[PDB]
Amino acid sequence: AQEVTQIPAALSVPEGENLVLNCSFTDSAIYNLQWFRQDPGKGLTSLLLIQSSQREQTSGRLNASLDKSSGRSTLYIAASQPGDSATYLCAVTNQAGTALIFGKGTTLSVSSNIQNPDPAVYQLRDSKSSDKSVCLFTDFDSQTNVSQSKDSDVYITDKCVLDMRSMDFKSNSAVAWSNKSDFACANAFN
Amino acid sequence: MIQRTPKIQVYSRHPAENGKSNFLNCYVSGFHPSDIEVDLLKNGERIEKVEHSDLSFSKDWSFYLLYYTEFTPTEKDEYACRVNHVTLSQPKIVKWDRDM
Amino acid sequence: NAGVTQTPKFQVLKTGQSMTLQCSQDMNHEYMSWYRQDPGMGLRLIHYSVGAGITDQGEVPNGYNVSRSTTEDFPLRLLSAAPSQTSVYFCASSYSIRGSRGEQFFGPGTRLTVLEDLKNVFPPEVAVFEPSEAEISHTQKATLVCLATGFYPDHVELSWWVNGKEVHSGVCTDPQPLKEQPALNDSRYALSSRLRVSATFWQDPRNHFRCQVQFYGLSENDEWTQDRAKPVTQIVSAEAWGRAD
Amino acid sequence: SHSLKYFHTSVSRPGRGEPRFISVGYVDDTQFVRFDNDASPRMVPRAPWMEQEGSEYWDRETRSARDTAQIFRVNLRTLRGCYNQSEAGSHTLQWMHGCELGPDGRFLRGYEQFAYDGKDYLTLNEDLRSWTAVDTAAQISEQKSNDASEAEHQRAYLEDTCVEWLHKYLEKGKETLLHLEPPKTHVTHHPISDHEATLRCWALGFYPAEITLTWQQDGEGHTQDTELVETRPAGDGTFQKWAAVVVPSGEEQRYTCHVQHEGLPEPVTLRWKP
Amino acid sequence: RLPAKAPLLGCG
């Protein structure tokens, strides 16, 4: 059958940096190659269609190339932005030319540049009941990895970046909590 | 849309000898469309153990089939090929002539 | 044109149950296809059609049937639901496969979870946590945390609502939920989200903040005899008003 | 030459379900495989030297035939629309493709032709890089395919896969496929009237199928008006043919039959003897 | 061996 591979499975680049997404396929006998973007919890949306006789297709900072003989397509993302963060999937026509076969996709994370990081931990109280709280690690560098808890009664989330567009301000944050009262937010993160 | 009437050859694999096992061939060729009914007859009666080749066609797109059965020719037995096709008003019967 | 429509968006099934995933398109497309998406497996072709009355097997056809009696509809039937059929199901159509007009349009997908027992199904509990005094004074910014706990399966959509308006910016949710018992394989899930506004906005007591978790659980069809409210599809939310502290 | 050819036939039967679909494979004048969607709806061996191929080969060939059947079902709908025919009538789409080797055993040429209802529709050019409309408006679908792309996929098959596998088949069945069987020749005499008799020149048990039978008269350089029958299969893999000339009764010994066949080192000449 | 692809025929 037609076999589609995408290298690598996961990619993390600082914003502003050029990056390549790779697609290789075993059977060069294709009519079309197609690149798709998939946002979390949503369907695929087509970015670029390259016909078998075409060599490249451009869409802003996206430029895809096709080399049939070599069995390769490269999606070049110039000056990458946080908004480029998504799963990128490559598809070619199956051997019968009746359906599309997909690679497993590349998950791209373009990390937001925190210009003046100010790492701090805070304690937040439940709006309904006191003596019920969560810990917030916030305003840390985008290159700082959130450590797993290693307690099993203490839960720690992965980081996400939010955009306060009103103040042209981005901030990373992670949450931690427990059902034990022998737990302070200080050194809850490591 | 073209319509061509089957050409029908009825013949043995080997020169016929009464009492010697042989193969009876009915070769239908030059026909279009492909839909066709063919029976080998012994003394007017349809032969049951009859096999045929797979549908193929010639340069001019006309179809050809070989229908055949193992048989022992005799003095008394008459063999024929009965062919029905959309181009024929009635089924055509071609008797086995040993010199054709 | 609506493009490619899929129903339902979420579904729970008991092992052995039958289920038709509906797909339609109003673009008059001859070519339609079904894929399943699984972590580290990618998007795999189940069945495909090259026209009305014409269907064929894909990469992973076993366990699934399709029919194409019309151009518009391409339904996918699970004959006998198995846990291995837990996946996200995408229906796709295109004007052509081999032509210049080769763009493939996808439906929004159907998240399917097949369970041995519906016993394990729970809706989320939701709490909003008010911003820190220390954060306000240091940054002049106010971070609210929403926390959804003890939900199963992982069938949730979390949204923030400020003054009854859905927030699309100043927010991020965890990309994944946490297993509350990572050891257990039928573990319920926790999910957190953050809403960050100016200390100003939070300090305005006319401003209402609500985190909403839409849970997709059992439908009206499903049997339920447990000494416990049926864990149906439902919204669970928590609130907080601003304070001039 | 040597050749690897397939002959595909799709026949619509509206109301009675999907079209009838048959593919047959030939190496030279020897059929070796067949697919029939009415038959085990799979590609099956039709020569003894094909019977020891693995399930991998048969599964692949079955799916290629299946996929061709499905596309030909789409093509029959397209062609019905194209000629503005009723949805009630049965129609035929035929597809012929083949590659040939030269003396050296390298690719000599390829060809593909389509016919709708027994008439030339579309032909692949000798360069294998474009298609020629034989009927007006005949094309690769402009809207749902690409002339150049379709030609390219068939060109690769004809120049590469077709040549490679023709060699594999010629090797597997070499004892039968590479053996030249010369024709057994004789002349029979059949009086048809008081004044005329038919001289019939026989060629029996020959392979391959290509053969020339001509009648000449002594003292005349030109060849005579000849009744030729269609070359016919014996059923054992060899072929039969005869050429007949109607001559005046008593003058039969003035005529010569001339037989040309690859398996004959030089042309054979026969004369009827009473 | 068969080709994997059957050409798609059209009109005009």
Side-chain angles (χ1 to χ4, degrees), chain A residues 60-77:
Chain A
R61 289 183 298 96
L62 302 175
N63 182 238
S65 60
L66 176 63
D67 188 0
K68 294 222 308 145
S69 61
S70 80
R72 164 164 303 281
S73 188
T74 303
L75 181 55
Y76 203 100
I77 307 194

Side-chain angles (χ1 to χ4, degrees), chain D residues 64-106:
Chain D
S64 282
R66 162 79 181 184
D67 292 329
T68 300
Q70 296 287 57
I71 290 292
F72 271 37
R73 194 172 175 189
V74 176
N75 287 333
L76 279 170
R77 292 175 181 185
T78 301
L79 292 167
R80 186 217 51 73
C82 279
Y83 291 93
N84 197 22
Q85 293 157 332
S86 162
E87 292 180 33
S90 178
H91 298 271
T92 309
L93 177 58
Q94 289 169 267
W95 185 33
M96 189 280 294
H97 60 73
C99 62
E100 303 191 358
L101 310 182
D104 50 358
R106 293 171 151 76

Side-chain angles (χ1 to χ4, degrees), chain C residues 167-234:
Chain C
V167 171
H168 294 274
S169 202
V171 169
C172 67
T173 305
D174 304 327
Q176 308 282 74
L178 298 175
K179 291 191 184 171
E180 298 198 325
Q181 256 90 32
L184 286 300
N185 60 300
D186 69 331
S187 184
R188 318 201 216 162
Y189 294 98
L191 189 70
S192 78
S193 193
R194 274 74 88 192
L195 169 56
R196 201 170 199 192
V197 298
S198 60
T200 280
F201 197 85
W202 167 248
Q203 278 159 4
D204 194 343
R206 292 169 291 178
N207 282 329
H208 186 246
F209 306 84
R210 192 179 111 261
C211 167
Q212 175 187 306
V213 183
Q214 175 72 68
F215 173 75
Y216 301 87
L218 308 189
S219 49
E220 286 81 345
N221 319 125
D222 298 317
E223 187 226 293
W224 188 262
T225 55
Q226 300 297 300
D227 291 351
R228 176 157 78 83
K230 186 180 190 186
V232 296
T233 298
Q234 69 190 263

Side-chain angles (χ1 to χ4, degrees), chain D residues 118-250:
Chain D
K119 271 151 89 155
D120 294 6
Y121 188 68
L122 190 74
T123 298
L124 181 61
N125 286 345
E126 259 287 301
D127 65 17
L128 309 174
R129 283 153 192 288
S130 55
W131 304 83
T132 298
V134 193
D135 210 345
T136 301
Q139 60 162 211
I140 296 297
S141 179
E142 262 181 316
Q143 309 91 330
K144 278 145 198 182
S145 191
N146 184 281
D147 176 282
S149 198
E150 292 285 21
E152 176 169 354
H153 302 322
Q154 296 309 315
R155 187 175 60 255
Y157 166 75
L158 287 167
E159 289 184 337
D160 190 356
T161 310
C162 188
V163 174
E164 176 179 351
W165 281 88
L166 178 45
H167 277 290
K168 288 180 190 291
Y169 300 142
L170 283 172
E171 184 53 52
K172 285 174 213 284
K174 81 165 180 283
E175 292 192 1
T176 52
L177 288 179
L178 298 187
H179 189 68
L180 296 172
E181 200 58 45
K184 273 71 76 199
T185 53
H186 72 287
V187 170
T188 52
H189 171 250
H190 311 281
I192 61 167
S193 70
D194 295 340
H195 59 107
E196 291 190 316
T198 295
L199 287 176
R200 186 167 288 124
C201 184
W202 289 92
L204 298 174
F206 59 88
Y207 188 93
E210 187 56 35
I211 191 162
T212 307
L213 302 178
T214 51
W215 277 101
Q216 276 181 48
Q217 193 180 350
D218 285 348
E220 300 196 346
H222 60 87
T223 65
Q224 304 294 122
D225 293 341
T226 301
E227 194 197 352
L228 288 166
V229 279
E230 218 81 16
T231 302
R232 71 204 196 186
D236 58 9
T238 71
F239 295 89
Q240 306 178 356
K241 199 188 182 70
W242 57 256
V245 69
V246 179
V247 305
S249 310

